[PDB]
Amino acid sequence: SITDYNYKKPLHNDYQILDKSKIFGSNSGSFVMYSMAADAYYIYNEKESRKRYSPNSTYKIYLAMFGLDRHIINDENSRMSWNHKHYPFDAWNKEQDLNTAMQNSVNWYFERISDQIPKNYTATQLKQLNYGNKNLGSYKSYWMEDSLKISNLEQVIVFKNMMEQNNHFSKKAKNQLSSSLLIKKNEKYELYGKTGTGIVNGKYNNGWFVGYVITNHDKYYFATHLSDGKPSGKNAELISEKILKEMGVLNG
Numbered sequence: 001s002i003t004d005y006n007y008k009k010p011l012h013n014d015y016q017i018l019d020k021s022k023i024f025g026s027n028s029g030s031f032v033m034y035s036m037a038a039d040a041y042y043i044y045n046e047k048e049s050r051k052r053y054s055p056n057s058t059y060k061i062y063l064a065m066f067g068l069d070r071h072i073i074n075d076e077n078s079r080m081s082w083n084h085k086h087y088p089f090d091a092w093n094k095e096q097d098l099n100t101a102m103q104n105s106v107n108w109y110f111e112r113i114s115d116q117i118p119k120n121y122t123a124t125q126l127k128q129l130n131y132g133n134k135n136l137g138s139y140k141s142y143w144m145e146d147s148l149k150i151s152n153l154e155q156v157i158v159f160k161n162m163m164e165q166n167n168h169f170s171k172k173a174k175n176q177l178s179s180s181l182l183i184k185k186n187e188k189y190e191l192y193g194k195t196g197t198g199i200v201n202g203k204y205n206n207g208w209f210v211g212y213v214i215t216n217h218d219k220y221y222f223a224t225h226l227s228d229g230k231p232s233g234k235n236a237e238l239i240s241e242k243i244l245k246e247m248g249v250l251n252g
C-alpha cells in the first residue's frame with residue numbers, strides 16, 4: 001500500500017502542461033481536462049494531479065450508477081422517503097429522487113443505496129473501472145474521508161471511460177446519471193458536474209469538482225482538486241469555471 005497513494009501509470013496520450021497558478025491563487029491543487037476531439041489531456045500541476053485523495057461526494061456519481069445498474073433505483077421510480085431525521089439543511093429533510101439527491105448532495109439517499117449494494121459487486125466494479133486504490137476498507141461510508149482514494153488525473157480518466165466506452169452500464173443509466181448532474185445549459189454549452197468537500201476537525205481539507213462540458217464542437221471531461229488554502233468543493237467549482245471560461249470552453 002506504499003504507492004497506493006499515487007497513480008504512477010504513464011499517459012500514452014498527447015498532453016499539454018498548463019500554468020493556472022494565477023487562478024488558483026493561495027489555494028494548492030491541480031486541474032485536469034480531457035478533450036474527446038483531440039484525445040488529449042491538459043494538466044496543471046501533474047505531481048498533485050497524481051496524488052490520491054478521498055473522493056468524498058464526487059463518489060455519489062458512482063453510487064448513482066451502481067444503484068441504477070442494480071435497479072435499486074430506476075427511471076420509473078428513484079424516489080426515497082425521508083427517515084424523519086432532522087438535518088441542518090431543509091433540502092435534506094424531505095423525500096428525494098436521484099436529481100434532488102444529487103443536486104443537494106443528500107448523504108442519506110446515497111448511504112441507503114450503498115447499504116443495498118453487496119461488497120463483492122462494488123469490488124468488481126472498482127476493478128473494472130480502475131477506480132483509484134479500490135480500497136473499500138470497512139465498507140461503511142468508505143468514500144467519505146476513509147479508505148477509498150483516487151487522484152485528480154484518475155477522476156477524469158475513470159469518468160470519461162465509464163461514460164464513453166461500451167461497457168456493461170446501459171445507455172439509459174448513463175442518461176439518467178447525466179440528467180442528475182446537469183448544472184448549466186445555454187446556447188453554447190451544457191455543464192455537468194459534482195462537488196465534494198472533506199472536513200477534518202472543523203477545517204476544509206479536500207475540495208473537488210468533477211464533471212464534463214458538451215459544446216457544439218467538442219466534449220470535455222475535467223476535474224479540479226484542492227489540497228490546501230480553502231480546499232472546499234464550492235471553491236473547486238469556481239476555479240474550474242474560471243479555467244474553462246478562459247480556455248474558451250464556456251461562452252455566454
Ligand SMILES: OCc1cn(Cc2ccc(C(F)(F)F)cc2C(F)(F)F)c(=S)[nH]1
Binds near residue numbers: 058103198
Ligand atoms: O463531500 C461532501 C460534499 C457535498 N457537497 C455538495 C453539497 C453539500 C451540501 C449541500 C446542502 F446541504 F446545502 F444542500 C449541497 C451540496 C451540493 F448542492 F453542492 F451538491 C460538497 S461541495 N461537498
